[PDB]
Design an enzyme around this catalytic site. Sequence first.
Site, short mmCIF file in Angstrom:
data_model
loop_
_atom_site.label_atom_id
_atom_site.label_comp_id
_atom_site.label_asym_id
_atom_site.label_seq_id
_atom_site.Cartn_x
_atom_site.Cartn_y
_atom_site.Cartn_z
N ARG A 42 24.80 -57.20 21.33
CA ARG A 42 25.36 -56.49 22.45
C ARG A 42 26.58 -57.35 22.82
O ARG A 42 27.41 -57.30 24.16
CB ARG A 42 24.37 -56.59 23.53
CG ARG A 42 23.49 -55.67 23.30
CD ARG A 42 22.43 -55.47 24.50
NE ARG A 42 21.12 -54.81 24.15
CZ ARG A 42 20.17 -54.38 25.02
NH1 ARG A 42 20.28 -55.26 26.15
NH2 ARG A 42 19.25 -53.60 24.59
N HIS A 47 19.06 -48.51 14.66
CA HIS A 47 19.34 -49.19 15.73
C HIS A 47 18.49 -48.60 16.82
O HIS A 47 19.22 -47.90 17.47
CB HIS A 47 20.63 -49.17 15.95
CG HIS A 47 21.34 -50.19 16.70
ND1 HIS A 47 21.30 -49.74 18.36
CD2 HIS A 47 21.81 -51.24 16.89
CE1 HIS A 47 21.71 -50.89 18.76
NE2 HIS A 47 22.15 -52.06 18.16
N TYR A 100 26.71 -32.50 23.71
CA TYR A 100 27.55 -31.51 23.96
C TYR A 100 28.70 -31.57 23.13
O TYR A 100 29.39 -30.33 23.05
CB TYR A 100 28.17 -31.72 25.57
CG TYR A 100 26.99 -31.68 26.53
CD1 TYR A 100 26.87 -30.53 27.08
CD2 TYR A 100 26.08 -32.60 27.02
CE1 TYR A 100 26.02 -30.33 28.15
CE2 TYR A 100 25.18 -32.56 27.98
CZ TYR A 100 25.16 -31.32 28.42
OH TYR A 100 24.24 -31.28 29.51
#
Lengths: 483, 483, 483
Positions: B27, B73, B117
């Site tokens: 991260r 992941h 979307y």
Amino acid sequence: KNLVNVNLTKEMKASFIDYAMSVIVARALPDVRDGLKPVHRRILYGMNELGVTPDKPHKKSARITGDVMGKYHPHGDSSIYEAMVRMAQWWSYRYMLVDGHGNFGSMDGDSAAAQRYTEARMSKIALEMLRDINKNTVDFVDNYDANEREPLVLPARFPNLLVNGATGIAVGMATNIPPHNLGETIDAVKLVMDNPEVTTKDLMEVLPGPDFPTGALVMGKSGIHKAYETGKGSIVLRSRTEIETTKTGRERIVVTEFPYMVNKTKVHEHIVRLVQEKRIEGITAVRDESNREGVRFVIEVKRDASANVILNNLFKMTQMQTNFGFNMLAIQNGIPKILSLRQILDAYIEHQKEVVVRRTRFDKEKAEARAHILEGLLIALDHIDEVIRIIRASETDAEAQAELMSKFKLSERQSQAILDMRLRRLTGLERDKIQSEYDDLLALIADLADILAKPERVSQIIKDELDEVKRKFSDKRRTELMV
Amino acid sequence: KNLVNVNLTKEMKASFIDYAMSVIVARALPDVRDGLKPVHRRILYGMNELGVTPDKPHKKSARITGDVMGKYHPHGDSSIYEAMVRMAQWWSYRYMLVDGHGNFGSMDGDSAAAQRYTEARMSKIALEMLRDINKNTVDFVDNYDANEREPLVLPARFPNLLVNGATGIAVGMATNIPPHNLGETIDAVKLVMDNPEVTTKDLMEVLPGPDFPTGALVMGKSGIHKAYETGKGSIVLRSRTEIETTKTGRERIVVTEFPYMVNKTKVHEHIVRLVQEKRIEGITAVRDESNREGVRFVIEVKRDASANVILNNLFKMTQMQTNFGFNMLAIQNGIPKILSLRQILDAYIEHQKEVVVRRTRFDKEKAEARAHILEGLLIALDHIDEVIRIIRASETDAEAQAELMSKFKLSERQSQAILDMRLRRLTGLERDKIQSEYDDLLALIADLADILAKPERVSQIIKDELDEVKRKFSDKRRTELMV
Amino acid sequence: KNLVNVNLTKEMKASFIDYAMSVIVARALPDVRDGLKPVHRRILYGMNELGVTPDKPHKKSARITGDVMGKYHPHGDSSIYEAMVRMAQWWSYRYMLVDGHGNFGSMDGDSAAAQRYTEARMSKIALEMLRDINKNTVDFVDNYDANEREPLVLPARFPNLLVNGATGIAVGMATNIPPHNLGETIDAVKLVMDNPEVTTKDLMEVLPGPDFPTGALVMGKSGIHKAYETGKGSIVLRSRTEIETTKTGRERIVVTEFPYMVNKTKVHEHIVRLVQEKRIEGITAVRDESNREGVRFVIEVKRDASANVILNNLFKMTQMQTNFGFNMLAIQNGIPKILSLRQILDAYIEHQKEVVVRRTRFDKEKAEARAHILEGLLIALDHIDEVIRIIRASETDAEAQAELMSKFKLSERQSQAILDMRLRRLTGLERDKIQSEYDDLLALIADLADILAKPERVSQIIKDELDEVKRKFSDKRRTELMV
């Protein structure tokens, strides 16, 4: 860069050990002596104190989790309900400690909405886990609200590590699920408690190994032997698949037992994708011919294709034959350790010896106090006339009990029992009952002293109650050990 | 205070190193050898294995992120889609590796709704990043599901650190974005690979510095020199502003290039607030005269006010002229280090030498195996009659291949090629083609051995493909280096 | 297992100290010198810079938190608004620094919806906390955007630790709330500042102890004495309950003051549950006879039951008489320390000495600069003719000011004041005003030098302003110290 607090050597060590131990205990790997997570322990003990047993119908889980929040465990409501849902599913968890009521999920991967939609209660196994708890069996502690008391470790009656396994979160250290068949486990406990040196080959004679909640095929007895010797290892999980050749010619792969904690839907979508990824061909189609009932699914291999080739290739690629690691890591004596099958069961037998000795000492305390009171009343029955003479010469109750304790060497409990003894009990029809019950309670005290004196009978009580559990619950392996 | 696990010295050190390294890698700050975060690396490799290249139209990003979850992941879906959105925006990211399809955001600060979307695919630069991956170029590893294989580091073809920068999260150590113009970067790579000692002043001759995705003005060549010498530094970002005096008298500030990762809307609201905070006056109004198209915005200074005073004061106050730190911190050899511009490019040149040597050895392996098979068939063409005599004397195929390998010193591959050689290929019209192709493949083997023998030609191949990339993509600086 | 970064010894120590100090400062225990959390400090200073004082009506809290996000504190919007809501409630917080406008919560436990529904402003106490801030009182620092400046520690005018307490999150180290009555606290400050050795018994003569925001009963003066000696301790909180016997016979428990941060609704539901848990009986019913107004609630004890037995049992079981720990842990000199009541007030008196010395030096700087300018004009009034002769002989303004500074030993400020002096001020009607004001400002300089020379007057100013605060705000104890 806001806080600039510098002098933090031993305070960062203490705070770091505190936050690390809080991770390891609360949100991570569970205990040896009952195999239960602290979230799970507070679930079972809160539902015990609410009394929500299978004599009553199912109650709303939101009230149970709210009582968990208000008494024992101030954390995420959805996390506590996640433990509720995972515990109360037959495929997610081998022996459902909580029996639920409503939609919880599916093997395809589904979740319940919240804690206020469905109901739950304890099943027949949580009453086993909580039988003889309120009897000085495990020491309580005060929790975060300093009015409630919770148990440190639940007094188990069957070793729940081997039954249900420990899923682990690594902050360096994670742990795995060896599930086991209950009856073979109890027989292994018996043989370990009989012979203090049984070889692990002779317990692999007893224990086959992974008794999955849905069944599978286990490849590799070498990894099994490595696991129950050292703790670390891996076995292979091949699904219960069979090749069925039609008279027409287009062969059949009947798959019935996907391995432990593997989705159905993801595997079938992965198979259809591997058909359309076009690395290898021969699969005609996949029939998912069940809604919720019966796990038997047909995937077709076309004409002129040996389905053992397709079967080996789906075992190579998909999540149908996987690896599965064993690393039996859990808390013993307050530290996390990788422990063997021998060590788990040695520690469990030591814990049941502790349970039996404490329960036996509690019942000896209770019967000894009752025999003490009944002996005081028996001394009252010995010289009734002197007691009456002092009561008639008394002025207050404290004077009467003090003079009785002075004259006949009595206790406060004994003197209160004498001064509250009913006059109707001053007959030979009542002295017979008191004397017979007094000899019976002294016989029970002698029996419990014989239990506390000989560790053989301790193991005997353990064997008897374990075989009672084995009669009440033990199914057999849904998983076949293949070679 | 639930878990009471004590003996945790080296286990808290190991778990703490594990959780810290997992933060730093997963991260946090990315790698030297490709400049890509591990989330980004799994994005590019998963979209490669799905084949979603610009030959096909755009595909739904939810399916790509679901394949990321199912293969590489297992983390936050919105975090993976956040990396998707940030990568596929021209202002958020210099050279859009992913080309998207739908509403993603604005420079005002806007977000897409979810991953289901809008659509996406790889752009023309990800095909560069993934060209020659499947050819023993970078070693794979097994990921968390032990069936998928992922690349350790993506084999880059242009050094992506200097192009796109590394945004950093400090757990003590954070890192910054020096962006760069691609063509000057490639020329800097060429000059470093030519002369092993080029002074950093002579590469500041090459490299101007920060090529922002929206353009700006950079003040301070001293901080630039400090940055590409030591790694730590700061430059100043002054927006492309100009003073335009009307014939009427009320002057004009035309602002066209806000600096790197600075909002438009927050700066204009801050300017209007500073008008109504009333510390300094002279601003008449602000005209935001665009919806999405064209970045040129007029803020008016009233009559009888020199707008350079207002311009210096908005540079002092607002986020229109800011500071910007450089701290080139990234992973080299497995550790995080602050590295210089020299060191980044030395390491990148070493990595491209590794890429070229491994790709050349792979193609030498492939052509050498094909030349081995073709040499076995050529030996079959040498003495055809003895081979036919043994085949006629054979009884099984294993006998035939064993006797051929015994008689003419052949391999299993060679003997299978002989026993599968087509009889139509037993002509001089076919021996000519086999012999000519065999000499051509040995010529290719000699060429690849000359590539593996001389590091000059390695640098030559690097120069050629870098100049190919420079032809295919290199724009110039949207940011002007001012003084 | 993605990141494999190894060489991380001192970097994991530095990153671990950084993340631990960021926890301790930002999201954890507050400071000695103002008792305010850094979230709270940025709330007060941002609402100061917005000027949202009680002269204006209440403003929308979303705009205030958005300015907090854009200037000082880039973290959770709901967390900043949680601090807003907790600060602006009379029961959640003793002296409401923020006065709100709208629905925030209840003692039953209720929350506001978001930051854009209700309004807020500073109350009469935040203007005290921010009086004399802009006058070199506490050194500013540059925050994360390098354009805004924030205060390190708010210059307090009353010691806010003892008033409002510090709730603490343990990463090993947590801290508690001793609240205090403001007037007795200020008198304790006065007596400590008078006699440098006052015994803590003689300050328990001054300070009773916990002045709760809703009132209670405090049992245990021994734990109070332990707390204000060593820091660690615990007292007991018994609610203001009274037994009222009806003429009918069914007695009454009137409960009016639940202890600090204890729900009403959870306690009444716990009482009804303990009636239906059936451990002890005698409670008839519970009357919750208020909606929001007046805290007086009747719980009925039946006929033939002494309600002191029921009262002691509800004190044993429920959250009506609880424990409450004191551990006065806060940041002094940059480190967290457990500090005593003596040490808190010694440090606060030292901080107010620092505040007074810095404010006095600032006003001496301001008046000294004005007296310097006025002395330059006074020297201009001394020899007006030479100044006029040089101005008539001047050619530029720089020449004029340079020749005046050369001829009469002047400053740049003095020469600019002379060359900008108005000719109407060249009269004896104006020389009188300048000379009188000059002597008055030198008198003020001598007064401030006498303040800076004698620490007695420093303590005097502290006493005067503290007694001003005591007049403006001091109520008395809503909590009764029982025995």
